[PDB]
């Protein structure tokens, strides 16, 4: 019953997903049997404050459907296991989206985001041993409704979290 309209984990090539500003986000490249690379993404920047981190995902059709769902695999750390005083650190993040069927170029600055919600983290991680952090992986699902244009953009904006996002997944379920 499930369609994927984006996988980002499964994708072949570049997701050619944008950040704002270029510092903030990064990619991500772990690399297969095969050397095929895994991108996933990720920011930290719990140093100073006053984070407005961005990372847009590239056009995605929708194939004609009209309600679906965006499901976020990732990983946040504690933020009482870093020092207090040193700067922000939150344990939420925000996700937007803006419909529309101008393929791809460049974005940001006007557009109008929808914010679908913010994402909160059931289970942060500690400096308590990597390998062992997938098991830290939490999973939030959310849909959207009646759809307009023949694709849409996700958006996420970081605010000092400290966060990998490890899978986004969009399906429609007919």
């Not at 404050?49 to 961005?54: A, D, G, K």
């Not at 914010?115 to 308590?128: H, N, P, Q």
Request: hydrophobic share 35%.
């Amino acid at each position: 019953n499930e369609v994927n309209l984006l996988d980002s984990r499964t994708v072949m090539g570049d997701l050619g997903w944008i950040a704002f500003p270029k510092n903030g986000w990064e990619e991500i490249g772990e690399v297969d049997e095969n050397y095929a690379p895994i991108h996933t993404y990720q920011v930290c920047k719990v140093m100073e404050q006053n984070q407005n981190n961005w990372l847009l995902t590239s056009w995605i059709s929708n194939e004609g459907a009209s309600r679906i769902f965006i499901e976020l695999k990732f990983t946040l750390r504690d933020c009482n296991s870093l020092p207090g005083g040193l700067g922000t650190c939150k344990e939420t993040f925000n996700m937007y989206y803006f419909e529309s069927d101008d393929q791809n170029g460049r974005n940001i600055k006007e557009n109008q985001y929808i914010k679908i919600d913010t994402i909160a983290a059931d289970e942060s991680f500690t400096e308590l041993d990597l390998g062992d952090r997938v098991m830290k992986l939490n999973t939030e699902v959310r849909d959207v409704g009646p759809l307009s244009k023949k694709g849409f953009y996700l958006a996420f904006q970081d605010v000092g979290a400290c966060i990998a996002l490890v899978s986004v997944r969009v399906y429609y379920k007919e």
